[PDB]
Scaffold this active site. Structure first.
Site, PDB file in Angstrom:
ATOM      1  N   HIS B  42       0.668  -1.262   0.002  1.00 13.17           N
ATOM      2  CA  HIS B  42      -0.132  -0.217  -0.178  1.00 13.17           C
ATOM      3  C   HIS B  42       0.500   1.249   0.142  1.00 13.17           C
ATOM      4  CE1 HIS B  42       0.624  -0.375   4.437  1.00 13.17           C
ATOM      5  NE2 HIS B  42       0.518   0.828   4.754  1.00 13.17           N
ATOM      6  N   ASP B  88      -0.424  -7.766   1.664  1.00 14.83           N
ATOM      7  CA  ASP B  88      -0.264  -6.025   2.078  1.00 14.83           C
ATOM      8  C   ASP B  88       1.692  -6.613   2.003  1.00 14.83           C
ATOM      9  OD1 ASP B  88       0.377  -3.675   1.761  1.00 14.83           O
ATOM     10  OD2 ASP B  88      -0.638  -3.310   3.712  1.00 14.83           O
ATOM     11  N   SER B 185       3.894   2.091   8.378  1.00 12.28           N
ATOM     12  CA  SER B 185       3.627   1.478   7.741  1.00 12.28           C
ATOM     13  C   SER B 185       4.639   0.481   7.080  1.00 12.28           C
ATOM     14  CB  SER B 185       2.573   2.082   6.712  1.00 12.28           C
ATOM     15  OG  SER B 185       1.537   2.545   7.653  1.00 12.28           O
ATOM     16  N   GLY B 186       4.639  -0.804   6.157  1.00 13.52           N
ATOM     17  CA  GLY B 186       5.735  -1.424   5.657  1.00 13.52           C
ATOM     18  C   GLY B 186       7.235  -1.294   6.157  1.00 13.52           C
TER      19      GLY B 186
HETATM   20  C1  LIG Z   1      -3.265   4.371   3.800  1.00 15.61           C
HETATM   21  N1  LIG Z   1      -2.792   3.966   5.418  1.00 15.61           N
HETATM   22  C2  LIG Z   1      -3.891   4.861   6.293  1.00 15.61           C
HETATM   23  C3  LIG Z   1      -3.021   4.758   7.560  1.00 15.61           C
HETATM   24  N2  LIG Z   1      -3.320   3.603   8.291  1.00 15.61           N
HETATM   25  C4  LIG Z   1      -4.001   3.244   8.969  1.00 15.61           C
HETATM   26  O1  LIG Z   1      -4.191   1.622  10.044  1.00 15.61           O
HETATM   27  C5  LIG Z   1      -4.470   3.333  10.122  1.00 15.61           C
HETATM   28  C6  LIG Z   1      -3.829   3.782  11.437  1.00 15.61           C
HETATM   29  N3  LIG Z   1      -3.629   2.857  11.821  1.00 15.61           N
HETATM   30  C7  LIG Z   1      -2.001   2.525  11.114  1.00 15.61           C
HETATM   31  O2  LIG Z   1      -1.881   2.443  10.547  1.00 15.61           O
HETATM   32  C8  LIG Z   1      -1.481   1.277  12.010  1.00 15.61           C
HETATM   33  C9  LIG Z   1      -2.295   0.898  13.181  1.00 15.61           C
HETATM   34  C10 LIG Z   1      -1.294  -0.329  13.777  1.00 15.61           C
HETATM   35  C11 LIG Z   1      -0.155  -0.659  13.278  1.00 15.61           C
HETATM   36 CL1  LIG Z   1      -0.040  -2.551  13.221  1.00 15.61          CL
HETATM   37  S1  LIG Z   1      -0.419   0.194  11.383  1.00 15.61           S
HETATM   38  N4  LIG Z   1      -5.815   3.193  10.492  1.00 15.61           N
HETATM   39  S2  LIG Z   1      -7.001   3.736  10.086  1.00 15.61           S
HETATM   40  O3  LIG Z   1      -8.278   3.252  10.217  1.00 15.61           O
HETATM   41  O4  LIG Z   1      -7.088   5.427  10.243  1.00 15.61           O
HETATM   42  C12 LIG Z   1      -7.364   2.719   8.368  1.00 15.61           C
HETATM   43  C13 LIG Z   1      -6.664   3.652   6.728  1.00 15.61           C
HETATM   44  C14 LIG Z   1      -6.185   2.983   5.418  1.00 15.61           C
HETATM   45  F1  LIG Z   1      -6.572   3.842   4.983  1.00 15.61           F
HETATM   46  C15 LIG Z   1      -7.463   1.564   5.827  1.00 15.61           C
HETATM   47  C16 LIG Z   1      -7.444   1.336   6.600  1.00 15.61           C
HETATM   48  N5  LIG Z   1      -8.594  -0.234   6.028  1.00 15.61           N
HETATM   49  C17 LIG Z   1      -7.856  -1.141   7.400  1.00 15.61           C
HETATM   50  C18 LIG Z   1      -7.957  -3.073   6.575  1.00 15.61           C
HETATM   51  C19 LIG Z   1      -9.556  -2.433   5.847  1.00 15.61           C
HETATM   52  C20 LIG Z   1      -9.696  -1.866   4.625  1.00 15.61           C
HETATM   53  C21 LIG Z   1      -9.062  -0.042   4.819  1.00 15.61           C
HETATM   54  O5  LIG Z   1      -9.323   0.773   4.444  1.00 15.61           O
HETATM   55  C22 LIG Z   1      -8.088   1.406   7.798  1.00 15.61           C
HETATM   56 CL2  LIG Z   1      -8.600   0.550   8.992  1.00 15.61          CL
HETATM   57  C23 LIG Z   1      -2.785   2.387   7.297  1.00 15.61           C
HETATM   58  C24 LIG Z   1      -3.554   2.302   5.974  1.00 15.61           C
END
Ligand SMILES: CN1CCN(C(=O)[C@H](CNC(=O)c2ccc(Cl)s2)NS(=O)(=O)c2cc(F)cc(N3CCCCC3=O)c2Cl)CC1
Ligand SMILES: [Ca+2]
Lengths: 53, 234
Positions: B42, B88, B185-186
């Site tokens: 991602h 991923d 992330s990553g």
């Molecule tokens: C693009 N980037 C945005 C930030 N991101 C997230 O997972 C966010 C913030 N939390 C984290 O990054 C993490 C938390 C714990 C670990 Cl380990 S990584 N949690 S979130 O709720 O704001 C979120 C952001 C996002 F872009 C995507 C998601 N998800 C989660 C899986 C299901 C599909 C989805 O869009 C989710 Cl849950 C990773 C992806």
């Protein structure tokens, strides 16, 4: 526990039960010692080891 | 990293950082060899052009262990879907080799059968990165690490508001406000065995950061070991 299940078969790294007898293998950048159990670094800064040097 | 400790000289040498067109880091990484870096799939849609910086511990101050590398061939898993974040995983082949030194070292790739029985049955693992220190917070100027326990798969499924696939695993705490976050992330999830650290997970996603009854979801690298091995030839 038995063999690889008991203290990693006395291997430094990878353990697989190759005919009951334990056979150990090492990660890239290491070499297997004459004992066949220890992993010896090829050069400086091998994988996995914290570089406090 | 929400909470945790900071990486001292040589503690987290496998940490890579993907920097966008404006010098800023957006994602984390793991050094596998002098030509290859491991990252989440991602991270490729975050910015149109990026490079990899190694040996960084402070984003503001130039350290001396810092070196930047250009990505030559980007390899992404052809089954990665951004709706589930399944598969991923991504591999980056660099143009020039990495010089291993203080703060710069690769992390060992484990064997599939051994890691499942030996490393996955360990109590804890280590996650590191330059990510957010709070869910609503900003990127950390300092490299941080955290001891994250392995979470039972049964409880992992019951806590998640999204699908947990075979290629994922849970790690972290139930209520204790310590987790990885956005920016991490990553990045690397490593597990220690006989004072040697092996790659076990890739920082993928989590419902926010450090929320009660929620965990860090990590790409199960062991399900992709043959796939990465194929990549590390051309
Ligand atoms: C693009 N980037 C945005 C930030 N991101 C997230 O997972 C966010 C913030 N939390 C984290 O990054 C993490 C938390 C714990 C670990 Cl380990 S990584 N949690 S979130 O709720 O704001 C979120 C952001 C996002 F872009 C995507 C998601 N998800 C989660 C899986 C299901 C599909 C989805 O869009 C989710 Cl849950 C990773 C992806
Ligand atoms: Ca720096």
């Amino acid at each position: 526990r038995k063999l690889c299940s008991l203290d990693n078969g006395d291997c430094d790294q990878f353990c697989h039960e190759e005919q009951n007898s334990v056979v150990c293998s090492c990660a890239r950048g290491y070499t297997l010692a004459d004992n066949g159990k220890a992993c010896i670094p090829t050069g400086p800064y091998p994988c996995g080891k914290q570089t406090l040097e | 990293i929400v909470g945790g400790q900071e990486c001292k000289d040589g503690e987290c040498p496998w940490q890579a950082l993907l920097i966008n067109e404006e010098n800023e880091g957006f994602c984390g990484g793991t050094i596998l060899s002098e030509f290859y870096i491991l990252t989440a799939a991602h991270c490729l849609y975050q910015a149109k052009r990026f490079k990899v910086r190694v040996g960084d511990r402070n984003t503001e101050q130039e350290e001396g262990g810092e070196a930047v590398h250009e990505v030559e061939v980007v390899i992404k898993h052809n089954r990665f879907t951004k709706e589930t974040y399944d598969f991923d995983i991504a591999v980056l082949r660099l143009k020039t080799p990495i010089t291993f030194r203080m703060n710069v070292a690769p992390a060992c790739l484990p064997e599939r059968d051994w890691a499942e029985s030996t490393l996955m049955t360990q109590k804890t693992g280590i996650v590191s990165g330059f990510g957010r220190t709070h869910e609503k917070g900003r990127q950390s100027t300092r490299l941080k690490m955290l001891e994250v326990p392995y979470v039972d798969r049964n409880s992992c499924k019951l806590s998640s508001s999204f699908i947990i696939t075979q290629n994922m695993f849970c790690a972290g705490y139930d209520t204790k406000q310590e987790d990885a976050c956005q920016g991490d992330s990553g990045g690397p999830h490593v597990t220690r065995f006989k004072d040697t650290y092996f790659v076990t997970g890739i920082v993928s996603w989590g419902e926010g950061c450090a929320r009660k009854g929620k965990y860090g979801i990590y790409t199960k690298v062991t399900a992709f070991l043959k796939w990465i091995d194929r990549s590390m030839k051309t």
